[PDB]
């Protein structure tokens, strides 16, 4: 049903990484990733880029050196998504202010145009064939 | 009357979360929430995503393990309300830029068109008279 | 020349604060505000919203309790200004992608339609007068 | 092939500053800029504006007093270039909301009307000829 198609995506990326993070990280870092609810919080703060590296990820990379992939992949993937709601909402907003009625007004203006142009077409037909007759007598 | 309609909702979402803040946290966290004014500055801090979690929320979450609702929800509400204040401005910005005129220049263009098409409904109607006379005059 | 109107303004606000700030704070907080360049770098850092409070503002507010006006006002005002520079660039950006090019077709493609109607006006007019030199040459 | 054009401009700016940065800073700040890999992470971190100053910049400018240029300039160039990516997406978004479609809805529609007019045009000519001959046959 539109934007909330992406929202649902965001919740899902969250859930995937929150689980991924609790599996990978819970033992060695329990306060940040000890439970799945814990990591939902951490990823929230990470997603808002708050001390994500200096206070959460650079620490985690010391234990697990390859774990920048978790953190950089999430910033990348979650930002791109958050971006879209912002877009998907900008757009659908423009649409209500404008596009919705713009297409409508001009669909309709062209009905008028077309109908006028239609009338002319007949008159020229009636006239066309008056002249048709008149010439046949001549 | 447009945007300061929301930009006020902002001002009261602030005022509420700032009283709720002081009542709840004033006592363990005096510096941050000790007084209503002290909590505004703190949420102004929080709203800008400045150190909100490592600096404030997680320490508050240490004392009141539920507090994250207060913090996560403030961010959702204030970020959004700010989003709208923004769209509202991006949109009314497009209007004056472009939709103002494209809408109007068009009404104009298609008056002109309509007039011309009327013009010749006329001749054609008149020519249908002349030919209508040739027929009776025979 | 458009947005670069505010771009100039932003720069003015920036510099007025870097001076308003070196005058107020440089005595007591030299590393942050000691020289003008010093304050500028720190106000750039405050503009990027980075450690603006837990880092710089809070410690300055505890010498100079009133000093929140400075950091809150600077963020508010400079965010508003960057907000607009941003919109102005979207507007301007999409004036190019589409709107300029669209109005170029809407116009030229109605030159076409107008011209077409003008030709049919003449034809009906030329016709309208043979049909009435019949009315006279009989 | 579009903004991907611009995304490539960004990846080039990283590369340049990550190398300018590892050459410049790896002796004194090995953790941050020790190796290219290190240096990029650090720059991605600066780009998200995460402690770029209190955490990374100000410490280095302690040691190399002029390095405010490396950091300030990277945040501009780096950030200004990510803006154009954000616009570019914002645009190609509308292209496919609307512009794509309304743009061509109208091409179609003036075919609809050009074609009509063309028709009327035919008939009026046709009528003229009929008047032409009516005219001659009777002179
Ligand atoms: C998409 C945005 C959703 C982000 C909201 C995250 C909510 C996380 C949550 O409900 O956690 C339950 C309790 O964990 P808590 O935050 O108390 O753990 C801190 C370590 N002691
Ligand atoms: C939205 C602008 C795009 C820039 C990159 C986004 C990262 C910063 C995210 C701000 C977090 C605010 C909470 C998101 C609301 C989601 C529901
Ligand atoms: C829209 C959001 C703008 C909110 C600005 C907050 C105003 C703060 C205020 O009026 O009260 C006095 C300042 O308290 P202060 O920040 O000095 O407390 C630090 C702890 N000693
Ligand atoms: C709007 C964006 C422009 C802002 C960039 C400002 C850069 C100013 C600058 O380089 O000043 C240098 C003077 O001192 P410094 O930056 O070294 O301060 C630390 C003292 N230990
Ligand atoms: C453009 C945006 C993408 C930039 C992401 C940069 C990631 C760079 C990378 O993964 O390289 C190797 C990681 O080194 P690491 O961050 O582990 O170094 C810590 C030194 N103690
Ligand atoms: Cl538009
Ligand atoms: Cl027409
Ligand atoms: Na931060
Ligand atoms: Na931030």
- Alpha-carbon distance of A70 to A63, in angstroms, equals 13
Pocket residue to mutate for ligand 1, from B62, B67, B72, most atoms within 8 A of Cβ: B72
- Alpha-carbon distance of A51 to A60, in angstroms, equals 13
Please tell me the experimental approach by which this structure was elucidated: X-ray
Q: Could you tell me how many CB contacts below 8 A there are between chain A and chain D? A: 83
| Best residue of A117, A119, A129, A134 to probe chain D, by most D CBs closer than 10 Å | A117
Write down which chains contact chain C via at least 3 CB pairs under 8 A.
Answer: B, D
Backbone break loci in chain A, preceding residues, C–N > 2.5 A: none
Long-range contacts of A68-71 (CB under 8 A, 24+ apart): A68/D41, A70/A17, A70/A20, A70/A21, A70/A24, A71/A46
Q: How far apart are the first and last CA of chain A?
A: 69
SS3 at position C122: helix
- Alpha-carbon distance of B128 to B131, in angstroms, equals 5
| D127: nearest Cα among C113, A134, C85, B17 | A134
Contacts of C66 in chain B (CB under 8 A): none
For domain D1-139, give the CATH number: 1.10.287.70
Residue A59 structure tokens: 């620490």
CB contact under 8 A, A124 and B120: no
Q: Give the experimental resolution in Å.
A: 3.0
- CA of A114, closest CA in chain D: separation in Å? 7
Task: Collect all residues with Cβ–Cβ distance below 8 Å to A138 and sequence separation of at least 6.
Answer: D134, D137, D138
Write out the DSSP string of A64-81.
STTTHHHHHHHHHHHHHH
Tell whether A62 is in a known binding site.
yes
DSSP designation for B3: G
Query: What is the domain partition of chain B in residue ranges?
Result: 1-138
Cβ neighbours, 10 Å, residue C17? 21
Gyration radius of chain A over CA positions: 32
Q: Vertex A50, ends A15 and D16: CA angle to 5°?
A: 100
* Phi, psi of B17, rounded to the nearest 5 degrees: -65, -20
DSSP designation for B35: S
Task: Collect all residues with Cβ–Cβ distance below 8 Å to B14 and sequence separation of at least 6.
Answer: B40, B43, B47, B78
Which CATH class for the C1-138 domain?
mainly alpha
> With contact defined as beta carbons under 8 Å apart, do B13 and B91 qualify?
no
Q: If you measure from the C-alpha of residue C41 to the centroid of ligand 4, how many angstroms do you get, rounded to a whole number?
A: 3
Residue D114 structure tokens: 């050009």
- Alpha-carbon distance of C22 to C12, in angstroms, equals 15
> With contact defined as beta carbons under 8 Å apart, do C52 and C78 qualify?
no
């Amino acid at each position: 049903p539109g934007i909330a198609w992406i929202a649902l995506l965001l919740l899902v990326i969250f859930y995937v990484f929150a689980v991924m993070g609790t599996k990978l990280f819970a033992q060695s870092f329990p306060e940040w990733f000890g439970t799945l609810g814990a990591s939902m919080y951490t990823l929230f703060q990470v997603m808002t880029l708050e001390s994500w590296s200096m206070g959460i990820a650079r620490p985690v990379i010391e234990a697990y050196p390859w774990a920048w992939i978790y953190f950089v992949s999430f910033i990348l993937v979650s930002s791109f998504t958050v971006l879209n709601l912002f877009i998907g909402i900008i757009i659908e907003s423009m649409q209500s202010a404008h596009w919705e009625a713009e297409d409508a007004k001009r669909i309709e203006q062209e009905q008028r145009a077309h109908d006028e142009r239609l009338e002319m077409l007949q008159l020229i037909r009636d006239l066309s064939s008056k002249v048709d007759r008149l010439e046949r007598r001549s």
